[PDB]
Design a protein around this ligand. Structure first.
Ligand SMILES: CC(=O)N[C@@H]1[C@@H](O)[C@H](O)[C@@H](CO)O[C@H]1O
Ligand SMILES: *[C@@H]1O[C@H](CO)[C@@H](O)[C@H](O)[C@H]1NC(C)=O
Ligand SMILES: *[C@@H]1O[C@H](CO)[C@@H](O)[C@H](O)[C@H]1NC(C)=O
Ligand SMILES: *[C@@H]1O[C@H](CO)[C@@H](O)[C@H](O)[C@H]1NC(C)=O
Ligand SMILES: *[C@@H]1O[C@H](CO)[C@@H](O)[C@H](O)[C@H]1NC(C)=O
Lengths: 220, 648, 213
């Protein structure tokens, strides 16, 4: 609904080798309270270091990145601004063993759901050396029945492309003590937040408060 | 690479200190990537010869910066100009170790100039901070006609206007003057009692002597001065407890040299990595050019900070200011100065003993020495303020009422040419009686000198607009309160402040027994059948003028209208006027009182009544509280039924 | 007394062609029928060049700049908009000999105006090497009398600030010849106009409209 007045889009060579002076000049000329960035982890560290050099990381601006950057999720490196916002899927804090338990469960339910339909488990087709096989209808039907699954109150529905559709993403942000923490959930297209206003921190912490913002009380 | 920097001094002993400082700075970075040199030149009694000496020094090497200091000469004004002009011709950045003149901050005249000590005009921020901390709102500023004093007064006034507070009274005297008691007498007749002083030492001493002779240095007064007014012969005779300020380590002339050298080295370290090595100019005759990267070097040096300086962290403002240097509060404790607190321009921290005041009292004085004998201005309106002539005995005739109590009457003088005395009574006079009894003051009622309610207007051949009538009298200072049915509008609220409303009303139509609200084309378009009028120089005129869509109606009204009163009601009665527009209560009382008159329709634009008072007057809170408690007591209902409801 | 409803004020930072990106964005989002600019002659060649790429030089738009720019009035440069209004002092087309004669005439007129008082012909200071002139002698009357002397029916009242107060000034513009021409004087505070209607000479705008009675 909102107009979403775009300000500027820029593409720069943030690779291991290149002219840093040109990128410094381009970053030095910008004016916008909100940034959205897309790059790789090494590109992310280079870009954030350069932004810290050219004073774009203070309490005035806000940065946003997708899940492609930020890497390990358990070891935030240096030069990562506090207040970084990303969006990751559910189960961003489970164990490796827990994830495999979900992986075997989804295969087991898929076979069981197909079992109720036809009472069988399709035979394997594993001749890597021979490499035979035209289009096969039995395996195709098994794969088609493998798409939708639901168990333990978690809806896994894969689109025709190999990605799941309608998940419950959780937004995360970098706390004041260099630690990822949850900020806001998302569940059937309605967003929630832990904070009614965005906490703004400073170089020496001591969260600053906007002078031209005020809270209004009332009732019905 | 060999990097050369220059400096100019006059000690011939601190030059060795500068050499040691530059050597120590080169010790921080001496890997032959950048190598530092040093040059120095002494001052001369001749300004022109000093100019050619600076020329020779600049052609001596490929200089990148210039450092200048104050010699033992007593002419501290024009001392750094001969070097500054020649350096700025070639756009060579310079730095001033010790300088306080406020003429070097004009970047349009001095192209390249930096500084490491706060000039004299930046005290105003400290004064504003002190006023905010101590909560002193009504202040008086006395200054001189010099450029620095005018600039400081302008800066203080700009800060106050940003706070939207303004100054109570500003008075300035020409420099180099004596026997100036007239200005002090003029400034002594105001409620606010706090004095801000900024002048030379001799002027400060003369002002102190005049004030001491004028008794204005006693109790109840708190006057603060700057740093130049507490030195020399001025500090000899001065009232005790005079507040002041001083620099952290000013006039050292040696502590700032190290900081300047370090800053120059740090700037030139980053500058040397640029692609544009302009090779700063070497030549003084025939070189009619400028340095190609002079502005770049100036910008780089401006945005270069320091880690640990002797005078603290060093930064630069938009023009090269000291960037929050320290300041030390002072006092006059029995002919001896003393430190009372330390402030760095952002906050004050009292870390010393108690501070005494000119009257010798320990309690913190408050400004706005309140009076007890106010003048009151009013206007003649029928239901509210009745004007009657007095008897020969000196008292106007008594008039009892059916309730069993007499009507209160007061003597009002002023009305027209004449200034004869009369008697005033009615609604607003009773309200004034109760208000004065509650808030403990004395009144001397009088009338206006024009008859108009008051309307802002700009006369021809002028750019300033002055209020007329009662409103103009209030601002001019002839009246301290306005007890009259004065409606509250935005334009009025711009320049004065009202109380809470004590009566609500609006605008309606008076017609002698097709007329309706303002929608008929007979009213929208002029016609001889129906003629409408107002009272000019009033609020309704402004209302109908502040409407583009009603320009024709405004022109029709401006064709003819009354500068009058109930006389306009008579004009309606005499069939000369068809209908009248005015305040609701005024028309309604007369419509229900006499005979054969009826109000048409109902109100269409509503507004209230209020007492007028000067900007940020201290009387506002108590007036509002008393009015509210009289609303809720039921006293205003009794007054209403007595004066307005006893009809029909 | 007019309403004089202003749209916006923009402060640019234009110089060498290195930092010339934010200014383009700032100028791209600003629209007005009339512009008043303030820059030096060394920055006009950049600001008009940038404006020409953002659609700000069309006939529907007009410009107005002070006399600080356009220093070389003899040969106007390129990239300048056609029809730019500026104000210059009197005798803009006068010759150098005329200017020298006018200056000498003003100085000698002041000298003779003092001479009519039969007081003196004050001598100048000694030299530079002695740094003389500690105070101001009675010679300040010469400077005072050198202020309000006119010549050939031309007001030369000099303000105490060192600038003349109310000579006559004219308005010039660039016609379709790359040559400045006079438009109207401002004698006695009344504006004269050679054109009752602006010519607006030369996608587009500013279409003409007709109605009647
Ligand atoms: C407030 C504080 O602790 N220190 C301030 C600091 O701004 C300054 O640099 C230092 C030395 O000049 O003394 C003072
Ligand atoms: C989808 O879910 C239904 C419900 O259990 C199941 O019967 C079906 O096999 C699944 N797959 C497809 C392709 O319908
Ligand atoms: C009124 O003033 C008198 C002295 O002038 C004082 O005695 C009395 O207490 C005051 N009353 C109030 C309510 O201020
Ligand atoms: C207002 O009333 C308070 C107490 O109610 C009193 O201290 C104060 O002096 C009054 N204000 C003025 C301006 O007299
Ligand atoms: C010009 O100024 C001088 C000041 O010395 C004054 O005497 C003279 O009357 C002035 N002339 C006119 C025409 O005002």
């Amino acid at each position: 609904h909102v107009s979403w007045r775009l300000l500027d889009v820029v593409t720069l060579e943030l690779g291991p080798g290149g002219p840093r002076a040109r990128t410094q000049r381009l970053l030095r000329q910008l004016d916008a309270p909100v940034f959205v960035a897309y790059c790789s982890r090494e590109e992310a560290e280079v870009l954030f270091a350069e932004a810290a050099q050219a004073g774009l990381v203070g309490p005035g601006h806000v940065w946003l990145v997708p899940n492609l950057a930020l890497g390990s999720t358990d070891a935030p490196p240096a030069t990562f601004p506090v207040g970084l916002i990303s969006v990751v899927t559910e189960s961003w804090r489970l164990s490796l063993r827990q994830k495999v338990r979900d992986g075997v469960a989804i295969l087991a339910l898929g076979a069981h759901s197909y079992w109720r339909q036809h009472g069988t488990l399709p035979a394997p087709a594993g001749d890597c050396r021979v490499h035979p096989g035209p289009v096969s209808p039995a395996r195709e039907a098994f794969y088609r029945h493998l798409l939708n699954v639901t168990w333990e109150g978690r809806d896994f529905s894969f689109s025709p492309g190999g990605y799941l559709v309608q998940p419950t993403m959780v937004v995360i942000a970098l706390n004041r003590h260099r630690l990822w923490e949850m900020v806001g959930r998302w569940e059937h297209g309605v967003l929630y937040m832990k904070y009614p206003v965005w906490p703004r921190y400073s170089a020496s912490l001591q969260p600053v408060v906007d002078s031209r913002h005020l809270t209004v009380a009332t009732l019905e | 690479k060999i990097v050369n920097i220059g400096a100019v001094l006059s000690t011939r002993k601190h030059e060795q200190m500068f050499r040691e400082a530059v050597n120590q700075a080169n010790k921080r970075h001496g890997s032959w990537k950048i190598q530092l040199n040093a040059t120095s030149v002494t001052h001369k009694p001749n300004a022109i010869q000093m100019a050619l000496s600076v020329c020779e020094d600049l052609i001596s090497s490929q200089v990148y910066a210039i450092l200048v200091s104050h010699p033992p000469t007593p002419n501290d004004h024009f001392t750094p100009t001969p070097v500054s002009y020649t350096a700025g011709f070639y756009r060579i950045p310079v730095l001033g170790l010790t300088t306080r003149m406020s003429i070097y901050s004009d970047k349009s005249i001095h192209l390249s100039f930096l500084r490491t000590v706060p000039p004299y005009s930046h005290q105003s921020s400290v004064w504003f901070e002190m006023m905010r901390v101590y909560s002193w709102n009504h202040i008086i500023l006395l200054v001189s006609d010099d450029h620095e004093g005018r600039a400081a007064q302008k800066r203080l006034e700009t800060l106050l206007e940003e706070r939207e507070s303004k100054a109570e009274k500003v008075l300035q005297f020409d420099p180099g003057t004596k026997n100036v008691t007239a200005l002090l007498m003029e400034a002594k007749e105001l409620e606010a009692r706090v004095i801000i002083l900024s002048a030379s030492e001799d002027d400060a001493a003369t002002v102190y002597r005049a004030a001491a002779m004028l008794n204005m240095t006693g109790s109840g007064y708190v006057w603060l001065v700057g740093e130049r007014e507490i030195s020399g012969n001025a500090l000899r005779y001065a009232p005790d407890g005079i507040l002041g300020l001083q620099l952290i380590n000013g006039k050292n002339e040696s502590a700032h040299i190290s900081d300047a050298v370090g800053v120059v080295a740090q700037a030139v370290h980053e500058l040397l990595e640029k692609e544009n090595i302009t090779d700063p100019p070497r030549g003084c005759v025939g070189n009619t050019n400028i340095w190609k990267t002079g502005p770049l070097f100036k910008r780089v040096l401006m945005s270069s900070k320091y880690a640990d300086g002797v005078t603290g962290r060093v930064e630069f403002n938009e023009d090269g200011d000291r960037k929050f240097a320290n300041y030390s509060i002072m006092n006059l404790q029995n002919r001896k100065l003393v430190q009372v607190g330390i402030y760095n321009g952002t906050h004050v921290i009292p870390n010393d003993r108690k501070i005494i005041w000119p009257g010798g009292e320990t309690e913190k004085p408050r400004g706005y020495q309140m009076s007890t004998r106010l003048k009151i201005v009013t206007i003649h309106q029928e239901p509210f303020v009745y004007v009657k002539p007095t008897l020969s005995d000196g008292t106007c005739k008594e008039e009892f009422t059916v309730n069993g109590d007499p009507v209160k009457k007061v003597i009002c003088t002023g009305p027209n040419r004449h200034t004869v005395p009369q008697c005033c009574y009615g609604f607003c006079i009773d309200l004034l009686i109760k208000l004065a009894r509650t808030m403990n003051f004395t009144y001397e009622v009088h009338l206006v000198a024009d008859g108009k309610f008051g309307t802002q207007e700009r006369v021809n051949n002028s750019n300033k607009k002055e209020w007329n009538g009662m409103m103009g009298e209030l601002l001019s200072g002839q009246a301290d309160m306005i007890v009259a049915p004065l409606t509250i509008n935005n334009e009025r609220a711009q320049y004065i402040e009202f109380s809470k409303p004590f009566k609500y009303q609006g605008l309606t139509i008076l017609v002698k027994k097709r007329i309706t609200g303002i929608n008929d084309p007979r009213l929208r378009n002029p016609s001889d059948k129906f003629i409408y009028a107002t009272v000019k120089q009033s609020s309704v005129d402004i209302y109908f003028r502040r409407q583009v869509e009603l320009s024709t109606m405004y022109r029709h009204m401006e064709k003819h209208n009354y500068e009058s009163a109930a006389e306009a009601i008579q004009a309606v009665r005499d069939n000369k006027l068809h209908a009248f527009i005015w305040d609701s209560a005024v028309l309604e009382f007369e419509a229900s009182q006499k005979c054969d008159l009826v109000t048409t329709g109902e109100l269409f634009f509503r507004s209230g009544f209020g007492i007028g008072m000067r900007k940020d007057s201290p009387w506002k809170q108590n007036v509002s509280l008393s009015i509210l408690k009289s609303h809720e007591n039921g006293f205003m209902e009794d007054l209403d039924k007595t004066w307005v409801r006893y009809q029909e």
